[PDB]
């Protein structure tokens, strides 16, 4: 409720809330308002119970396909039970197996996401927050939830602001609004109307901000959900979740598979009716054919591949809260990033120095992994001693594991920055201050604009040295001599304008400049001279100037390289911040969002001296958009802005406007990633296709809204995420191709049983042993394939056109490789039946006699007479050999699925998981064939040596065919072979 309370007079404020601004609310009025208007708490986002999350895992695209398959199998089994005589339990087995696969995969995914949620909950901590309210005429330490509208609240330094406040009294109050507004530097607070916008006026304090220094008193104008943070929370809660890009790809794949399965089933249903089977048998055939196309083992494969990528990312302190988020960065075309706390450290840091007529550039990185400056002159030693001794700041308790930049201190941001800079450049400041004990303090204040101090000199002079720091134009009037190379010269005409040429230069960058001086007091004061601040017992003139130090909020060390890599990957990087346009533009230039040499229209106009309309729209590749302009921008104008400029900076933007920008980018067909840390990024983080929040600097609401957390606030993890997402997309393509290839040798035996009336070449048990057995580890091992080229040199995939599964993959798996695999199994089937006495021509149309349980003298090609059990054992041996042949030809399929463009001799065989998978599937096939008792448990029988060798020529054929195909693809880019087969 900050609509008008800032522009209200001190009398109307008292009348509006029926309170007097010296005594506060009556001790009963507060209780009445508490019980009539509710507590001072923002309502948390709704909490979903565990079983609902588990059931959400149990359903979904692939899971629903497997559920449909299980239901169809159960219906088929019911029909067989009701109408047929002695039906087998194949369909019951299939129903149970499909249900169990769905349930186990759901359990696995739920467990992974619950682990991530537990880590997030452990990170979130609660400490009882209490406020200070002037109730009953005295100070009370009430709980934060009991603060009511109109309450009189006093805030001191280091105190969180309890609610939205309209300040009436203040004494040097400064608050940190970086999380709410995006302003890094603390903002001064005064009890007067300054700006029309409530977020800019200096007489309003907002809930969820920290008071940094001073003290103030104010009236509560908004409570709970009516606060600025609460409205942002409601806006975030009112947003839909949205579908991840990988989920859409899985949905498209399910559509394709359903179409293929239904077409095959209906065509063979019609064929069965034409061949004279019967409606019931035709329905059974239709259900079986439709179910046989369902790849029940591919669901677990996809889940495991996503989990492996998630664990790989977690190894690098990158937490994903769901498995589908592990791919989104690979598909990202646009990154919308906040500046303060996200691209920037959100910490005042020394940036430049000016001494010895020279400008030195400090190392602003957190780990000090940059360029040093010249530290040989003793003027640098004097400057370091001054800046470290006249500081009044100190590290806090324990931060010795942490780097100096990341440590916590006790004092002003400027004092902390000076302390850290001196600590990481000159020497330890604690030892310096021990060697130079203080005598007189003379604290800093605004009116004086300087901080004097007196210390015992380290050089063993037994005397004292006065050290002064403050505003450059303030301390210059006191110093009549400067220091050039440790030589105490005097004031020249040159050394009174180079001071104004460097101050105007370091102050022109938006940085906060400071001056330093010393005097080296005469020996008449000895050691224990009474130094009285209230009088002039010590000289305060003709100081010796040393140098200037400037400070600014710097970018994070990894940010510029990450931005450069993302732009090399074809990703558009947009800066969206709530800070001032000058700071935003400076940071955008510093991190590469605005490239070197690119100009804005307002700069081309000032260079060519032409009106902004006369500016050509070909040299203004960069634009800076103020948030005030966005209030009068329509969808069409926003689309024009987003399309016509490669480099865009949005400054002074509200959370609602960040959401609008993200929605506009998504409306143009882009997959959008948002990186932010403050509460002003939460709606954009939730609306984004992938939301990434900083683990350390981020707020709880933004970390709840985000899909991914950078636990160490490392921006280099985004490039790794893009690379991993692209690689996971490619490897999913390979794994899906490998899994879909084996479908053809699994359904063609049943098709030929129906059409030709031959004994069934492959059984349900062997088919299950392929899908959930020998094919699982090889399919998983394709997730460990390395990139065949530089994936970061590709453009982002077009989601409309570039699909995970398309018609090329179907044609390769079903039409070409699956057919060769199917012919390999039929060859072994025929060789076994011919070696046992049934020539291939004699097996055509034998189904009715072969399946007759009471025909026990069936005649073979030689005139031998067979019992039903004997020929069934022969058929089961043929099915076992068909299964083994499928295993053998899947060796070649796995070898050729390693690459989509490269030859095997180019990529090599460095995937150890693939080799292990080959060995494991071979050993599993051998185990099921030769283990005693496997003829009773399963219908699997031992094989002859030569029956293993029947699939070698077909495997070699598969390998040679794929090698030639990929050679042609490589030789003829964009040619017919590539357009038809390169999936």
């Amino acid at each position: 409720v900050v609509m008008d309370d800032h522009k209200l007079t001190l009398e109307e404020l008292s009348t509006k809330y029926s309170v007097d601004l010296t005594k506060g609310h009556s001790h009963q009025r507060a209780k009445e308002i508490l019980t009539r208007g509710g507590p001072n708490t923002v309502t948390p986002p709704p909490t979903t119970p565990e079983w609902v999350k588990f059931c959400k895992q149990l359903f979904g695209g692939f899971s629903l396909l497997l559920w449909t398959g299980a239901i169809l199998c159960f219906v088929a089994y019911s029909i067989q039970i009701y109408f047929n005589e002695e039906p087998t339990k194949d369909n019951l087995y299939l129903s149970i197996v499909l249900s169990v696969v769905v349930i186990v995969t759901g359990c696995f995914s739920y467990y992974q996401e619950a682990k991530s949620s537990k880590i997030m909950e452990s990170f979130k901590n609660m400490v009882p927050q209490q406020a200070l309210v002037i109730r009953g005429g005295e100070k009370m330490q009430i709980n934060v939830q009991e603060v009511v509208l109109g309450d009189l609240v006093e805030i001191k330094g280091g105190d969180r602001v309890p609610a939205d406040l309209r300040l009436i009294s203040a004494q040097g109050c400064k608050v940190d609004n970086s999380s709410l507004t995006g302003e890094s530097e603390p903002q001064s607070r005064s009890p007067d109307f300054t700006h029309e916008n409530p977020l800019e006026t200096r007489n309003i304090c907002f809930f969820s901000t920290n008071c940094v220094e001073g003290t103030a008193r104010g009236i509560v104008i908004a409570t709970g959900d009516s606060t600025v943070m609460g409205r942002i929370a409601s806006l975030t809660s009112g947003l839909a979740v949205g579908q991840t890009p990988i989920a859409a790809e899985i949905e498209h794949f399910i559509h394709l598979i359903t179409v293929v399965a239904v077409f095959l089933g209906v065509t063979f249903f019609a064929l069965s009716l034409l061949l004279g089977y019967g409606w019931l048998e035709a329905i059974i055939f239709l259900i079986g054919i439709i179910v046989a196309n369902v790849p029940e083992g591919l669901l677990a494969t996809v889940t495991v591949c996503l989990t492996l990528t998630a664990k790989r990312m977690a190894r690098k302190n990158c937490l994903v809260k769901n498995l589908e988020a592990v791919e989104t960065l690979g598909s990202t075309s646009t990154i919308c990033s906040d500046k303060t706390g996200t691209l920037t450290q959100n910490r005042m840091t020394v940036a430049h120095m000016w001494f010895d007529m020279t400008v030195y550039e400090a190392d602003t990185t957190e780990e000090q992994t940059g360029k040093t400056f010249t530290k040989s002159s003793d003027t640098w030693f004097m400057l370091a001693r001054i800046a470290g001794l006249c500081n009044r700041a100190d590290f806090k308790a324990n931060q010795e594991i942490l780097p100096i930049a990341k440590r916590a201190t006790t004092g002003d941001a400027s004092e902390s920055a000076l302390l850290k800079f001196i600590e990481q450049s000159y020497s330890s400041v604690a030892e310096m201050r021990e060697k130079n004990p203080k005598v007189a303090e003379i604290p800093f204040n605004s009116t004086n604009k300087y901080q004097m101090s007196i210390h015992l000199r380290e050089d063993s002079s037994q005397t004292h040295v006065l050290m002064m720091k403050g505003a450059p134009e303030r301390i210059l009037e006191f110093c009549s001599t400067f220091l050039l190379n440790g030589q105490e010269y005097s004031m020249n005409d040159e050394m009174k304008e180079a001071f104004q040429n460097a101050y105007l230069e370091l102050g022109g960058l938006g940085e906060r400049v400071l001056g330093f001086c010393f005097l080296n007091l005469p020996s008449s004061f000895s050691k224990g001279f009474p130094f009285n601040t209230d009088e002039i017992n010590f000289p305060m003139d003709n100081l010796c100037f040393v140098g200037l130090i400037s400070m600014i909020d710097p970018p994070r060390a990894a940010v510029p390289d990450a931005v450069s890599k993302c732009r090399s990957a074809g990703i558009k990087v947009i800066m969206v911040t709530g800070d001032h346009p000058i700071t935003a533009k400076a940071i955008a230039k510093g991190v590469g969002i605005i490239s070197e040499g690119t100009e804005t229209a307002e700069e081309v106009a000032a260079r060519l001296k032409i009106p902004i309309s006369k500016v050509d729209a070909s040299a203004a590749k960069a634009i800076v958009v103020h948030g005030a302009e966005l209030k009068d921008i329509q969808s069409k104008q926003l689309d024009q802005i987003l399309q016509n400029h490669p480099e865009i900076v949005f400054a002074r933007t509200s959370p609602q406007q960040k959401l609008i920008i993200v929605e506009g980018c998504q409306r143009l067909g882009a997959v959008v990633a948002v990186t932010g840390d403050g509460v002003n990024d939460s709606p954009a983080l939730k609306k984004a296709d992938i939301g990434i929040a900083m683990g350390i600097s981020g707020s709880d609401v933004s970390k709840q809204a985000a899909d991914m957390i950078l636990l160490d606030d490392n921006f280099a993890s985004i490039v790794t995420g893009v690379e991993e997402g692209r690689l996971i997309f490619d490897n999913l393509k390979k794994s899906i191709m490998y899994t879909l290839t084996s479908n053809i040798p699994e359904i063609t035996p049943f098709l030929m049983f129906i059409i030709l009336g031959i004994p069934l070449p492959l059984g349900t048990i062997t088919i299950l042993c392929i899908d959930l057995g020998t094919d699982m580890v090889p399919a998983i091992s394709l997730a460990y394939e390395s990139a065949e080229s530089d994936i970061m040199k590709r453009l982002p995939r077009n989601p409309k056109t570039d699909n995970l599964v398309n018609h090329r993959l179907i044609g390769m798996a079903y039409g070409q490789i699956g057919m060769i695999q199917a012919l390999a199994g039929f060859f072994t089937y025929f060789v076994i039946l011919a070696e046992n006495g049934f020539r291939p021509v004699d097996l055509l149309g034998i189904r009715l006699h072969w399946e007759d349980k009471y025909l026990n003298d069936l005649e073979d090609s030689y005139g031998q007479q067979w019992t039903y059990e004997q020929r069934k054992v022969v058929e089961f041996t043929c099915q076992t050999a068909f299964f083994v042949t499928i295993v053998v030809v899947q060796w070649a399929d796995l070898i050729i699925s390693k690459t989509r463009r490269n030859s095997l001799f180019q990529q090599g065989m460095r995937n150890k998981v693939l080799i292990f998978g080959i060995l494991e599937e071979t050993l599993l096939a051998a185990f099921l064939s030769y283990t005693p008792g496997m003829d009773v448990a399963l219908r699997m029988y031992p094989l002859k040596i030569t029956w293993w060798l029947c699939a070698i020529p077909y495997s070699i054929l598969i390998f040679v065919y794929d090698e030639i195909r990929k050679l042609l693809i490589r030789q003829h880019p964009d040619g017919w072979v590539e357009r038809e087969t390169y999936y």
Binding site: F827, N836, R839, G863, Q864
Partner: protein
């Protein structure tokens, strides 16, 4: 997404006529090559298959034991008073026994007389075409006695004394070995002929053993079983018109209106049995003569 049947671009289902022609031509050539490769591999394999002897016989040996009539569920249920209750049985028997008539075994270049008493197996050469087709021992219908069908054309079904014809499944080169020194089982069996593979039909349960009446065996010689001069069998290529020896079993004193479970078993050193295959070396038959 759902409107691709026709388009301004002359695109049928997404592709033009030229694209459709190219993709269909590619698949036609690819499947023709696959079919050629498959046919070639099949022919190369068949080159290694002998035309006179199967490569393996461990799945067909030991042979099974079957019976005529070919019944539906090992059940024989008929009423002697109703001639239509056993017409199917009698028709099945006469259809099976047509090739055993004397008039069908007249060619002296195909058939021969191999004695009226059981004899040792006859070695007719090696499994090849060295001497063309092998000769076939004759089997007379008169050996089947009252189940021969030469006097009673109903095989005892009209009288209520049904006949079953027992046969041993043909296996190439298989020579049955009768049990050694009468050391298999005990019954009023003339199991002293070393040239007969003994066969016996008994009641399945102890209840059945008391309700089966007299069992009559009709065959070559006085020993119930298969004479050994009809073995080995050389296959349908070398020995077409081959006749396997037959044993006729007639149940003359069956209890009426009750279902009788009967087990017929063959005995030999190379004759085996199984709990999974109920027809290997033996079979079960259920017979109910209704009053």
């Amino acid at each position: 997404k759902k409107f691709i049947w026709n388009s301004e671009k002359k695109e049928f289902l997404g592709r033009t006529g030229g694209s459709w022609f190219k993709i269909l031509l590619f698949y036609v050539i690819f499947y023709g090559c696959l079919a050629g490769i498959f046919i070639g591999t099949i022919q190369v394999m068949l080159l290694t298959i002998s035309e006179f002897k199967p490569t393996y016989q461990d799945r067909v040996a030991p042979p099974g034991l079957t019976q005529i009539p070919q019944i539906q569920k090992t059940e024989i249920s008929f009423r002697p008073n109703d001639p239509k209750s056993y017409e199917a049985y009698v028709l099945n028997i006469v259809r099976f026994l047509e090739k055993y008539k004397d008039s069908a075994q007249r060619d002296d270049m195909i058939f021969e007389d191999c004695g009226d008493v059981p004899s040792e197996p006859k070695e007719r050469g090696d499994f090849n075409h060295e001497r063309g087709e092998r000769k076939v021992c004759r089997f007379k219908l008169e050996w089947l006695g009252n189940c021969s069908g030469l006097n009673d054309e109903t095989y005892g079904y009209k009288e209520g004394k049904p006949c079953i014809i027992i046969k041993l499944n043909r296996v190439l080169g298989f020579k049955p070995k009768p049990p050694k020194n009468e050391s298999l089982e005990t019954y009023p069996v003339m199991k002293y002929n070393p040239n007969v593979l003994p066969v016996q039909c008994t009641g399945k349960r102890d209840e059945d053993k008391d309700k089966v009446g007299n069992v009559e065996y009709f065959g070559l010689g006085n020993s119930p079983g298969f004479p050994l001069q009809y073995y080995p069998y050389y296959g349908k290529l070398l020995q077409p018109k081959y006749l396997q020896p037959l044993l006729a079993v007639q149940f003359t004193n069956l209890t009426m209106d009750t279902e009788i479970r009967i087990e017929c078993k063959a005995y030999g050193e190379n004759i085996g049995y199984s709990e999974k295959d109920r027809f290997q070396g033996r079979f079960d038959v259920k017979i109910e003569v209704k009053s």
